[PDB]
């Protein structure tokens, strides 16, 4: 302990460094395939951000797979935007991509992203 | 992107989930040995927090090791406190452990921890 001190910037610094490892392809251990596109990532980061990836990588057989193929209805740009969000906290939400981002976030089980997509859509109707 | 929105709590939520994976021993890929004690962890988290572990796991031979043995002068409690800090942002700094925490943080190349240890020591002299 109750006597701990805390470094405010630590969590963001860790995330920034995990994104630098991803950029340089250091210790990436899985390829996510979204139709014709491939995305290299760290399984622990995916599990920490997505209920779907947590379910996949806690499965006794799927935990050992080096390639995961997503449903063909998933938009690669939508997945790219959510993968960037996982590694940076920043979501590039635009009129031209919001429906694909929302559909991808529902599939990946990322409720906070689903919620902001619903709010932006509702504001425009 | 320049049009991104940001989820303030994302980085801390990611770190909290990586610590939950560590607690449950999920996808841990290295054992750090500090004399008689063993600590299971994720190489990417260690690399994101420590200059020493970044150097170790970017080495073309050491990146593949599943066990890393630290210098015998390193105190296991000191290492435990810094490993908890890496996964939570919280540092359990006490009169009885500050010298060991500072020595361990210098070895692990964690400058922000070294800096607060120096400030607490200086305040007591």
């Amino acid at each position: 302990a109750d006597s701990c001190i805390q470094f405010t910037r630590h969590a963001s610094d860790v995330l920034l460094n995990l994104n630098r490892l991803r950029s340089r392809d250091i210790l990436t251990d899985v390829v996510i395939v979204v139709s014709r596109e491939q995305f290299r990532a760290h399984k622990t980061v995916l599990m920490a951000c997505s209920g779907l990836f947590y379910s996949i990588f806690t499965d006794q057989l799927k935990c050992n797979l080096s390639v995961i193929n997503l449903d063909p209805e998933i938009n690669p740009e939508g997945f790219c935007i959510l993968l960037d969000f996982m590694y940076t906290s920043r979501l590039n939400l635009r009129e031209g991509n919001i429906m694909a981002v929302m559909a991808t976030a529902m599939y990946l089980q990322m409720e906070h992203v689903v919620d902001t997509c619903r709010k932006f859509i509702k504001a425009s109707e | 992107a320049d049009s991104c929105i940001q989820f303030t709590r994302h980085a801390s939520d990611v770190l909290l989930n990586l610590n939950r994976l560590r607690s449950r021993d999920i996808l841990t890929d290295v054992v750090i040995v500090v004399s008689r004690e063993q600590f299971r962890a994720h190489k990417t988290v260690l690399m994101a927090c420590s200059g020493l572990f970044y150097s170790i796991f970017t080495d073309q031979l050491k990146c593949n090791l599943s066990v890393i043995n630290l210098d015998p002068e390193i105190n296991p409690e000191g290492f435990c406190i810094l490993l908890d800090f890496m996964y939570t942002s919280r540092l359990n700094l006490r009169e009885g452990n500050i010298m060991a925490v500072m020595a361990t943080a210098m070895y692990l190349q964690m400058e922000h921890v070294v800096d607060t240890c120096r400030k607490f020591i200086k305040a007591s002299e």
Binding site: Q6, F7, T8 | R90, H112, T116
Partner: peptide
């Protein structure tokens, strides 16, 4: 940074 959490 450091704070009392």
């Amino acid at each position: 940074a450091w704070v009392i959490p």
